Amino acid sequence: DSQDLLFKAESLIVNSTNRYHVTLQIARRAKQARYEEMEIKPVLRAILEMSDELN
Amino acid sequence: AKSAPIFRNRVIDKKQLKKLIGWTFAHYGTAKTAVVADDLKALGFR
Amino acid sequence: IPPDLRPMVQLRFATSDLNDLYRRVINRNNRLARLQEILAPEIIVRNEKRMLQEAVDALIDNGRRGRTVVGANNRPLKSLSDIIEGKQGRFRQNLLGKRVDYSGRSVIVVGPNLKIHQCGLP
User: Fold this and answer.
1) Residues of chain B positioned with their CB less than 8 A from the CB of A10
2) Hey, is the C-beta of B39 within 8 angstroms of any chain A C-beta?
3) What whole-number distance in Å separates Cα of residue C40 and Cα of residue A52?
4) With an 8 Å Cβ cutoff, is C115 touching chain A?
5) DSSP type of residue C70
6) Recorded GO terms, molecular function (chain A)?
7) With CB atoms counted within 10 Å of each terminal CB, which end of chain A scores lower, N or C?
8) Which phi and psi angles does A28 have, rounded to 5°?
9) Does B37 touch chain C (CB under 8 A)?
10) Which residues of C touch chain B, with CB atoms under 8 Å apart?
């Protein structure tokens, strides 16, 4: 849900120590995602993946 | 998290609401503060 | 200046004031050349040189030194300096702030059932 994405976003903003750097990482990840998927929306999947990787 | 809320047994003006929002942000984060603000908005409107 | 930066479009023809300023400069320069070719009286040549100086002045910055060159209506002509200065100048109207695509504008009403991260778009 939207709320879930909002909690995951907040979760990634913390433990990163740089909101800009983690926004750049999310952008890059989502770009790669859509690129290797054209072969859900990229930024959303990127945030889901990065949250699930933070264990 | 882990910070249990205090039972505010008093009248709630704007100052009390602002204090509660600040406490929620300080202890719980920015998305639980958003949720609390939405819930308080719904309750007040009702 | 390149002609597309002083466009002469057809609606009638709408012309930039730079065309008139350049025409004044060219007319006075050609007349000065003719006067220098026929060995005109010195006062006439000197007056033409003064006119050329004033025309170039009005082109670079209208009204800085002498009188202000008005147009068909009694308004100052926009010279080269007037383009890059002021709140309507190039820097503040086109470089530091622009009209952008993919934009809209509408009246706002209150959506009480929305969430803080949501908006109602028509």
Assistant:
1) 29-31
2) no
3) 91
4) yes
5) B
6) DNA binding; DNA-directed RNA polymerase activity
7) C
8) -55, -50
9) yes
10) 112, 115-117
**C16 vs C28: CA distance, rounded Å:** 20
Resolution in A: 2.5
CA separation for the pair A19, A14 (Å, rounded): 8
| Amino acid of residue C7 | P
Residue type, C44: I
- What chains are in contact with B, requiring at least 3 Cβ pairs below 8 Å? A, C
Detail the DSSP E strand segments found in A1-55.
none
Please tell me whether residue C113 adopts helix, strand or coil conformation.
Answer: coil
Breaks (C-N over 2.5 A) in chain B follow: none
CA distance C9 to C29: 27
Q: What are the angstrom distances between the C-alpha of C67 and each of C24, C36, C109?
A: 15, 27, 53
Instruction: List chain A residues with CB under 8 Å of B30.
Output: 10
Breaks in chain C after residues (C–N exceeding 2.5 Å): 11
Smallest CA-to-CA distance from A46 within A33, A54, C42, C17 is with A33
Distance CA C15, CA C3 (A): 11
